[PDB]
Design an enzyme around this catalytic site. Structure first.
Site, PDB file in Angstrom:
ATOM      1  N   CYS B 148       0.835 -64.679  -4.463  1.00  0.00           N
ATOM      2  CA  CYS B 148       1.378 -65.756  -5.251  1.00  0.00           C
ATOM      3  C   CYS B 148       2.842 -66.028  -4.871  1.00  0.00           C
ATOM      4  CB  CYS B 148       1.219 -65.467  -6.750  1.00  0.00           C
ATOM      5  SG  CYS B 148       1.994 -63.973  -7.322  1.00  0.00           S
ATOM      6  N   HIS B 389       4.272 -61.927 -11.114  1.00  0.00           N
ATOM      7  CA  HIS B 389       3.394 -63.038 -10.780  1.00  0.00           C
ATOM      8  C   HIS B 389       4.267 -64.281 -10.674  1.00  0.00           C
ATOM      9  CE1 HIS B 389      -0.199 -65.351 -10.387  1.00  0.00           C
ATOM     10  NE2 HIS B 389      -0.161 -65.887 -11.593  1.00  0.00           N
TER      11      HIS B 389
END
Ligand SMILES: [Zn+2]
Ligand SMILES: [Zn+2]
Ligand SMILES: [Zn+2]
Ligand SMILES: [Zn+2]
Ligand SMILES: [Zn+2]
Ligand SMILES: [Zn+2]
Ligand SMILES: [Zn+2]
Lengths: 93, 433, 92, 93
Positions: B148, B389
């Site tokens: 990510c 994340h």
């Protein structure tokens, strides 16, 4: 007739500036949407979820754990969430 | 087949010579609007021939004669009937108006793409309009194992007007010497754009091929998982590929001292002025590709810039100051959130910092006029420095914002976007007074 | 507030303001020659400020989010093509 | 003498270079205070409401509303500026 003053002329000048800019923005808007609608008669807006759970097609998050990608370097199905780690070990070949 | 086309332009378009004449005039009017200095443009395209007012609403340039007529006093409408000239071009935007329909003609591609008039028949037969689903390039990238930090950046690149224009213009494809997406980054990125905006071919995964190619490229060239570092990595690869495809890289370099015509260096680069102290004793100019800002004990982005721009600390004075010598077309900001301490531990700063939808850079350039940027991209981080994340948020035309969370693309209110803990910010130049 | 008498005579003269109240005989088509001479202008990105505060070789798109990315898709290979790239792509 | 007072003043503003400044200043402010994107939203909303992309129709519901959304601060600031420019070139009784 009204008694024309610096204030009235000035409001008039501002209004010209204001209306021209509004009419520019609206023209750009109406031409775009007219285009989208003529181009796609079945056009659907992107889904919006106040709950923040559904995507632009109104669907739930797919589970990436249970997806797989076929690796062209070794011809194996690989779990998607593992493709990066797999590549490091597979491309070594 | 609900929405119809102006029957009037359609009628006139039954005659070829008439079709070519209308298009030539449209191109002509549009050309003039793009090559008129402000005063000329006001006095010559926004001055109504009847009431002689400037900007009396939109002013329209007639297709059939030299007249310009205003909206607010209905002076083009009067012209259309008394002379029979029913098509006029709004001098603020080049859109063609029909005064019988009393509406803009916005849904005829030929008019919208007039620049291609001379080739229209080829264009129409060999290319098609975008598919409904791909028209906005929206598609998620699966997280393939802590990637990510890459996908968040790619999403912002893929929705950056400048990079998107660059890829769709075939610049790189036309000059590349590798021609392989599994080896050339730029080729890999071209393929992503291809997948997201067009059609790549004739589970549950879709449109991940380019991204996979990019990982493969990445591996060939060869952790921290810092999205900012990958931003820098990828913009560097685009530049190196530009330089690789030149016939004469060496001599162009000494030609114009360290100056580059690549997409990266014509869009993202600016320069900082480092000044020593009422003249400045010394001045060093240093390029940047982004500004890295400190956020400690600050609540707002302006405060961060203010800090970065502060005076600190001889012939006639001594005081040190950092300011902007040259601004980029796309300004990218990193809010420093990752501390790496001497004992090897890592500390994340989760401070919320307010950032505006429009950023005025005038106070930070070494009177400076308003220089206003539009926020079009946010990368946000959640969690620890290494086990976190990243999520992207992008603004596309019409003001809609979209959140990219790996494979999930969702719509989000601007109000909620603004509440995000920003890590990278992408601003595009919008107005310069 | 105060009623306007008129515009200062001195100003009328400086700027040659005295005009004909009737319709103009101007033509926007007359502008073409000056337009061809003149480099690309932006509606609201001042040329002189651009020279000063931006790089000479900067890429500039005005109001990039004004409307969607305008493109077409090649029916042969499916690539998305910028309008200004279509012809050349159809030739290669 | 007549209603050419306004056009004549605008001609001065343009030629003097001051119309640019006013137009740019107004735009800068309206953009920064969120008004430009407000009017785009309002236009989109009015299209959906009236199920039309017809410009004339859409303009008539947007413009009045759009003029009204200009913040007091921008309105009275650009008015003040326009006024000062005219103070310089008009005579009063
Ligand atoms: Zn493999
Ligand atoms: Zn019509
Ligand atoms: Zn008029
Ligand atoms: Zn005419
Ligand atoms: Zn390549
Ligand atoms: Zn470069
Ligand atoms: Zn092709």
């Amino acid at each position: 007739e009204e008694t024309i003053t610096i204030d009235s002329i000035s409001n008039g000048i501002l209004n010209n500036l204001l209306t021209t800019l509004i009419q520019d923005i609206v023209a750009r808007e109406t031409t775009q949407q007219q285009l989208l609608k003529t181009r796609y008669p079945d056009l659907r807006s992107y889904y919006f979820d106040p709950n923040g759970s559904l995507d632009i097609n109104g669907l739930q998050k797919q589970q990436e754990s249970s997806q797989y990608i076929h690796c062209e370097n070794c011809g194996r199905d690989v779990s998607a969430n593992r493709l990066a780690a797999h590549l490091q070990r597979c491309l070594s070949r | 087949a609900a929405m119809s086309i102006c029957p009037h332009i359609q009628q006139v378009f039954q005659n070829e010579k008439s079709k070519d004449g209308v298009l030539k005039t449209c191109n002509a009017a549009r050309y003039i609007l793009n090559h008129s200095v402000p005063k000329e443009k006001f006095l010559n395209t926004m001055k109504c021939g009847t009431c002689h007012e400037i900007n009396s609403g939109a002013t329209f340039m007639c297709l059939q004669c030299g007249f310009c007529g205003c909206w607010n006093h209905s002076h083009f409408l009067s012209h259309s009937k008394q002379i029979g000239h029913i098509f006029g071009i709004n001098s603020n935007n080049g859109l063609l108006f029909c005064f019988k329909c009393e509406d803009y003609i916005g849904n005829i591609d030929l008019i919208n793409d007039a620049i291609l008039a001379k080739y229209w028949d080829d264009v129409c037969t060999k290319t098609m309009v975008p598919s409904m689903e791909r028209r906005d390039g929206l598609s998620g990238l699966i997280n393939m194992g802590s990637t990510c930090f890459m996908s968040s950046i790619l999403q912002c690149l893929i929705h950056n007007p400048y990079f998107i224009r660059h890829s769709m213009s075939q610049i790189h494809s036309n000059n590349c010497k590798v021609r392989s997406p599994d080896k050339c980054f730029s080729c890999a990125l071209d393929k992503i754009v291809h997948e997201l905006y067009g059609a790549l071919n004739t589970t549950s995964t879709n449109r991940q091929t380019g991204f996979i190619y990019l990982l493969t490229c990445a591996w060939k060239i060869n952790s921290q998982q810092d999205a900012h570092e990958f931003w820098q990595f990828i913009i560097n690869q685009i530049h190196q590929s530009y330089v690789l495809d030149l016939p004469n890289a060496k001599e162009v370099s000494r030609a114009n001292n360290k100056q580059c015509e690549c997409i990266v260096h014509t869009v993202f680069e600016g320069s900082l002025e480092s000044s020593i102290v009422q003249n400045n004793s010394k001045t060093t100019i240093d390029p940047f590709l982004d500004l890295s800002l400190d956020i400690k004990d600050k609540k707002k982005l302006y405060e961060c810039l203010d800090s970065f721009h502060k005076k600190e600390q001889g012939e006639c004075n001594a005081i040190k100051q950092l300011g902007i010598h040259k601004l980029p077309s796309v300004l990218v900001l990193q809010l420093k959130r990752f501390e790496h301490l001497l004992n090897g531990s890592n500390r994340k700063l989760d401070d919320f910092i307010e950032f505006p939808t429009y950023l005025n850079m005038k106070n930070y350039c070494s009177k400076v006029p308003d220089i206003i940027y539009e926020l079009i991209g946010i990368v946000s981080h959640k969690g620890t420095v290494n086990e976190g994340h990243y999520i992207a948020f992008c603004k596309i035309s019409g003001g809609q914002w979209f959140k990219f969370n790996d494979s999930m693309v969702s719509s989000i209110s601007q109000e909620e976007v603004l509440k995000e803990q920003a890590y990278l910010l992408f601003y595009t130049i919008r107005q310069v007074n | 507030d105060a009623e306007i008498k008129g515009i200062k005579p001195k100003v009328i003269e400086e700027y040659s303001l005295s005009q004909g109240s009737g319709p103009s005989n101007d033509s926007w088509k007359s502008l073409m020659s000056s337009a061809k001479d003149t480099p690309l202008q932006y509606d609201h990105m001042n040329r002189e400020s651009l020279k000063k505060y931006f790089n000479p070789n900067a890429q500039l798109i005005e109001d990039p989010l004004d409307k969607p990315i305008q493109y077409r898709v090649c029916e042969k290979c499916g690539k998305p093509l910028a309008l200004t790239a279509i012809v050349d792509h159809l030739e290669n | 003498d007549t209603a050419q007072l306004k056009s004549q003043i605008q001609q001065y503003l343009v030629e003097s270079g001051n119309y640019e400044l006013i137009s740019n200043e107004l735009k800068a402010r309206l953009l920064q205070e969120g008004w430009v994107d407000k009017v785009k939203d309002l236009t989109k909303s009015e299209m959906n409401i009236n199920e039309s992309t017809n410009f004339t129709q859409i303009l008539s519901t947007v413009e009045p509303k759009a003029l009204e959304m200009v913040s007091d601060s921008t309105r009275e600031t650009v008015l003040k500026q326009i006024r000062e420019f005219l103070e310089e070139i008009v005579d009063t009784q």
